Amino acid sequence: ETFPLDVLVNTAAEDLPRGVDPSRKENHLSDEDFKAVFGMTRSAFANGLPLWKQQNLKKEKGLF
């Protein structure tokens, strides 16, 4: 299921939709939002970057 930034920015497990993996919120952005936010392919991000870099970027975008 895809959700807007204003939903996924939420930190409390209870304030998030059931269908969102809170540790992989980027997976629940639309393709257009993912590109807008991260500027790279889903593969470049999830596979290409080391996890620590993925986490650092997500923290900057409010998606960690």
Using DSSP, how many helices (H) and how many strands (E) does the chain show?
A: 4, 0
Query: What is the spatial distance between Cα 54 and Cα 64, in angstroms, rounded to a whole number?
Result: 9
Query: What is the spatial distance between Cα 64 and Cα 59, in angstroms, rounded to a whole number?
Result: 5
Strand, helix or coil for residue 20: coil
CATH number for the domain harbouring residue 22: 1.10.950.10
Domain of 51, in residue numbers: 1-64
Query: What is the spatial distance between Cα 16 and Cα 33, in angstroms, rounded to a whole number?
Result: 18
Enter the resolution in angstroms.
1.8
DSSP state of 28: G
The total domain count for the chain is 1
Query: What is the spatial distance between Cα 16 and Cα 63, in angstroms, rounded to a whole number?
Result: 12
CB 26 within 8 A of CB 45: yes
